[PDB]
């Protein structure tokens, strides 16, 4: 027992963009030496197992030698690179000296020297004038290289037509294509009957097909269609059985690829798609196709009104609407152009989404979902105050906004019931993102804004603040749901500053705050921003960790199957019950602006 | 109730030098009191606050005018240094003000409107600095600060290393301390866990080397120099005094809020560089490992640690070129010294002169498979499950990176000194595409797959179908395709594996196995399908099968092998020496990377 040796032909460097650049010589041959070589290699028991067309092309490109009577036409010890079929005449095979084979014509010899450089075993020395017809290796595997990679991209252009095959990568598809089984019938065979069940899909690729249908049990069937080369049917049958509704015959001699299923299941994100849908929806609607129907909010830069489509009255939104004499006024330019750009660009479940904006020369218009559960403040308002469990849900709900905006380098900067909405499931929303910012990571912004007792102590000394100023104010929020009012407060903004300057530690926390959430609202609540829980090396998830929240259902916060505290009553989309009722705006409008600097609008 | 947003104007650039008015120190100190006494302004930092006072500028007003009046529009904050104000609100008088008090700060956050009126009851004289200058001093001043810290920082060492949005918070931390002169800052001997920079002045640094001697000046360490490094890791023990020198500030920081903040296999980025000045002659030849179609395997060490042994693959130039297999030279070299996996021997680099190429690779002293099956005759089902795993991971590695290997046979598994196997032997492996297919005749023909032999075009899953030979031969001793001349061999192959009668021998698990990974269609073979390579780590076969504990290494081979030295080459076969006549030269280029 020895090694075995390792053997190679020469290597391919061969793609679909050399086929029309190969030559495959053709030398003219009568019929009945194009049957003798058809014949001598189907019985060949290696060459046997080529297909049909390719020894047909092989029998094309063979080209003739002729010899003498006492020649030699291989040597034992030469090196071999052809293939033999005798034509006229008998040819004697010897080995060391022994007569081994005698053979004659239509037999193929040689063969193994069409896969590799052989060393031949035995010299072959003619008796008689022979004809032989001969073809190298290398235009042999020329042939199989051409006409198998021809068929099978030939087979890959069939499948990449197929709906059903459209979705699927390059890869996979070329699997496929070495799954489909060419199958001939006859012009008149029914290739599938009406009524029959089937598994198997098929692909015309030569002929033409009558596709048959009785309307009726007892009408003679009725022509219907007729399908050609890249045309298929049966489809339905590569997600399950298939009921065949027509009756498909062979108009001529057809080839059809198939493929059933059981082969097809052996090997087994819809986002520009959805969301480029509801894209298109609202890019060609003006502002003549809503009515005000309804008021949801009074603030401070926009009133906001709930509007209904005129054409679809299922489809409410919320609509802020800002008077541009006034936002220049305030010169809150680049805050309301902010808020477009963040909310539009946030898709989260716990931020009012925001679909588009529109303008005329007095007003500006934010077009939003509308949350119809009701404001966050009236609720506290109306209840005192939250439970421990309930304030972990609403602060769950921003927390989970936080580790979406934070992780996108967006600061929120109004975080207050007021700017808290519940769905009509219950869940909490961020809604007014005027102050919102995208910030760097570890850069820092200088703008003093926020709403007084929800302010950062950093933001007003001046001292440039960051995203840790929401976490200053999660704490606020957290006392001021659990009690009904916020920690630090005075009778006018500037002793309710100097009240935050002098820290969350000279409150006296009442009794009502356990001990876990004041815990957490105290290190939220750090003077230094680098202090402050959130903003350390785990962020967000640091806050999601902390005894308070241990015990809380996050992913089913997250999968929305967590049942929210206070479910409202929302009868329909135009029920506004969850709000207070709010006065005409009878004011004079604004002045027209058409300045310009509202163009991205 | 409801609470109103309120938001200043919104606002880099350093072309903006600040307005200075001259003051009497008199005047300065009044204005420095009473912003230090104001509840709101006293929180500023102290080097703001005299950048705010020598930015405010003077203000006169008469008797009987009105500084502010209420209704008004807030931007300015004010000081007097002299004078009596009145303060009303609605016609009705709050209080009188005098000189030394901060008013209408409120004006600084953003545009408020005046509460109350305040009117002169005399001749005043008053400090005023406008909102929209004090935003650009706490900007300024704010900004300058920050990357001045980050810059003395980054300095470091020990920081340096982490991400610039960590080291700003770290900036964040820092305390500033002032030291006058001959303050110790820190003294020999002292456990501390604060970690200095010096940021102002410059500091003697003196050591006692004994306690019966007296400190010694060492080092003097100035504006940007550290110390206390190692007290950010642990407690440290200072090795030295350090004595201010003249009026300094260094900023601190200790190792608790450090952690608090805080929380790279560059060893073959090292590995792969010691490996380039090697030259072809650093070496002596031991014995040699094998001999194949190309060319000899030596075991080769080298000269200056011998405890570092190599298999050297040697190749005759134009042995490869009368093959005309060039092209194959270069996917051994490509795929072997671009794959890191540890059941593929490495490929560390390559020499030439121009007759020979040499592969310097791993040494796996514990023998060939083959040897090692032709000795014992074949293996056990569980030991055969051991080496079958190994080639499963190796493919598992190729086929993922799109690499047919194309040559799998016992002779090209090797076993390192702990008995785990290895391939060897890449000539034929090619990167093809995924999808894609290739179409060269190349193998060992017991193990030829027949897609290879028919010439249909071949891909990864080439390398299914010899595993299945593999297990098959390994089990019984023998691989179950085999006539006395190739082309008998490569009919037997074509008539199939079901065409096979199965020894007994072979468990009804591993044929299950066998069968399905030698099926004549490609796309029908276990491993091919959606789940890939783990479809075969899946099988009944496999099923008990500690994968985990082979790839960490932790699971004991079938055959543990005797190797005592990296020298030591018994486990294999002798070898005579390579005493025909040298080759012809090749400068034709193809061995480019040589
Ligand atoms: N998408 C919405 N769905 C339901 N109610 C909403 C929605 N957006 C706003 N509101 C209500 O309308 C009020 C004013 O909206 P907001 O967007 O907060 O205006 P503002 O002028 O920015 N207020 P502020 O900036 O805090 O002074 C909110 O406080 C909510 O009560
Ligand atoms: N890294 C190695 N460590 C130890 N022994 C090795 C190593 N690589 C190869 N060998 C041995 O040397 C023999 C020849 O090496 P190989 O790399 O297989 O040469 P080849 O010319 O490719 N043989 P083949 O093409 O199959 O005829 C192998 O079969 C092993 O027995
Ligand atoms: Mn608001
Ligand atoms: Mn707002
Ligand atoms: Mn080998
Ligand atoms: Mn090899």
Known sequence: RTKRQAISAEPTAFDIQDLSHVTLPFYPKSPQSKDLIKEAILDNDFMKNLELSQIQEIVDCMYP???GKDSCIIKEGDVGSLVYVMEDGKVEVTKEGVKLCTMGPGKVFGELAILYNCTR??????????????????????????????????????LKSVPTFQSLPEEILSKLADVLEETHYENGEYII????????????????????????????????????????????????????????????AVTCLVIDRDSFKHLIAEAKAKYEAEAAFFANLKLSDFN????????????????????????????????????????QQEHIRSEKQI????????????????????????????????????????????????????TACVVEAFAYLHSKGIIYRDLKPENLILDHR????????????????????????????????????????????????????????????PPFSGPDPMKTYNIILRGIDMIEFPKKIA????????????????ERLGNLKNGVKDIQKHKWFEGFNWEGLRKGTLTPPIIPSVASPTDTSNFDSFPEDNDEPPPDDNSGWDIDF
Not at 292 to 313: A, P
Not at 362 to 374: F, T
Not at 515 to 530: E, F, G, T, V
Request: net charge positive; proline share 2%; aromatic share 12%.
């Open 65 to 67: 030698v002729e010899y």
């Open 121 to 158: 075993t035995a010299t072959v020395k003619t008796l008689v004038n022979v004809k032989l017809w001969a073809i190298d290796r290398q235009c042999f595997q020329t042939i199989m290289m051409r006409t198998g990679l021809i068929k099978h991209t030939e087979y890959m252009e069939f």
């Open 193 to 252: 009957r009406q009524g029959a069940r089937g598994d198997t899909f098929f692909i015309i690729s030569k002929g033409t097909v009558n596709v048959t249908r009785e309307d009726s049990p007892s009408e003679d069937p009725v022509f219907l269609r007729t399908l050609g080369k890249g045309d298929w049917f049966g489809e339905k049958a590569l997600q399950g059985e298939d009921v065949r509704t027509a009756n498909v015959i062979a108009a001529e």
């Open 292 to 331: 005000i129907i309804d008021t949801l909010g009074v603030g401070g830069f926009g009133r906001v009104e709930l509007v209904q489509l005129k054409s679809e009255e299922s489809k409410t939104f919320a609509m802020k609407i800002l008077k541009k004499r006034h936002i220049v006024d305030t010169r």
């Open 343 to 394: 909310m539009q660009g946030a898709h989260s479940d716990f931020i009012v989404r925001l679909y588009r904006t529109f303008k005329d020369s007095k007003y500006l218009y934010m077009l939003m979902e509308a949350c119809l559960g009701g404001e966050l403040w009236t609720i506290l308002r109306d209840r005192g105050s939250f439970e421990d469990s309930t304030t972990r849900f609403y």
């Open 426 to 485: 219950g869940y909490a929303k961020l809604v007014d993102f005027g102050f919102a910012k995208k910030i760097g990571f570890g850069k820092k912004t200088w703008t003093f804004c926020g709403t007084p007792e929800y302010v950062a102590p950093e933001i007003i000394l001046n001292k440039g603040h960051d995203i840790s100023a929401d976490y200053w104010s999660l704490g606020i929020l957290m006392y001021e749901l659990l009690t009904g009012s």
């Open 515 to 530: 001990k876990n959430a004041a815990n957490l609202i105290k290190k939220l609540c750090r003077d230094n921003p680098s």
